[PDB]
Design a binder for these strands. Structure first.
Length: 207
DNA sequence: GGAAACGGTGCTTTCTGGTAGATATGGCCGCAACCGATAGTTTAACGGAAACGCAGGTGATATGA
């Protein structure tokens, strides 16, 4: 419970309001990869923040590799500004984080068979083609990947607090699977997602 | 006190020609029936559309293979 989870990847999307010519967009970006022989879209990485991004002719975009809530909106706004420099209106709309990926380490090894046998209502553990166990948390809804080393991965979340709540909910379970710190201090010590996102310009006129 | 002689004409009769219905035979016209044919199901079984499931353009957390 003392080893607070770290975010590894935040993935988001934004609507542009207007349908646009993706070939025209592909002409001016300083990083771009695109070939209709394999896929009909441009892959578009940037230096700072270190995000990858994607654009669709229908007037929608996706952003990946964000380290913070801030990076997600700030990168999306900078990609939209590049499209506004180009011959399109690109009205920044529908900003959302569809998935969050985080990880933590309890520093003790886990008997995945014991976890799967006792919590089989939520746990799945297939024959060992892959070494890690998977867990389906239903309230709040989170997917957790459990490894024998004590390393843990969390995904399927969209709100920051639920990743820390899911870790805190399974830490007592993991701690029971032991043989021969445990205090969270608070459920969420850091500021909320909204108090982070509000540092970035929200108004679409603030290009 | 009446019946027998027989003149009146009222009432009736067949010989016939009229009125006119009848039908054996005949020739058109069209109804009753058959073998015929066109259209009908819904399924052998697989040709079809809509209905159906996995990939690929990033990324990449674990620790084994």
């Amino acid at each position: 419970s003392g080893i607070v989870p770290t975010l590894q990847n935040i993935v988001a999307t934004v609507t542009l309001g207007c349908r646009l010519d993706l070939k025209t967009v592909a002409l001016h970006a300083r990083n771009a990869e695109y070939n209709p022989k394999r896929f009909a879209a441009v892959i578009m990485r940037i230096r700072e923040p270190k995000t990858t991004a994607l654009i669709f002719a229908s007037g929608k975009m996706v952003v990946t590799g964000a380290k913070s809530e801030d990076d997600s909106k700030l990168a999306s706004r900078k990609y939209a500004r590049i499209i506004q420099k180009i011959g399109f209106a690109a009205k920044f709309t529908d900003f959302k984080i569809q998935n969050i990926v985080g990880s933590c380490d309890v520093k003790f090894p886990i008997r995945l068979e014991g976890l799967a046998f006792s919590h089989g209502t939520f746990s799945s553990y297939e024959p060992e083609l892959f070494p890690g166990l998977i867990y389906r948390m239903v309230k709040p809804k989170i997917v957790l990947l459990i490894f024998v080393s004590g390393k843990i991965v969390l995904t399927g979340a969209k709100q920051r607090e639920e990743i820390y709540q899911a870790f805190e909910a399974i830490y007592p379970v993991l701690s029971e699977f032991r043989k021969m710190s445990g205090s969270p201090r608070n459920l969420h010590l850091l500021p909320t997602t909204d108090t982070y996102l509000s540092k970035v310009s929200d108004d679409p006129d603030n290009l």
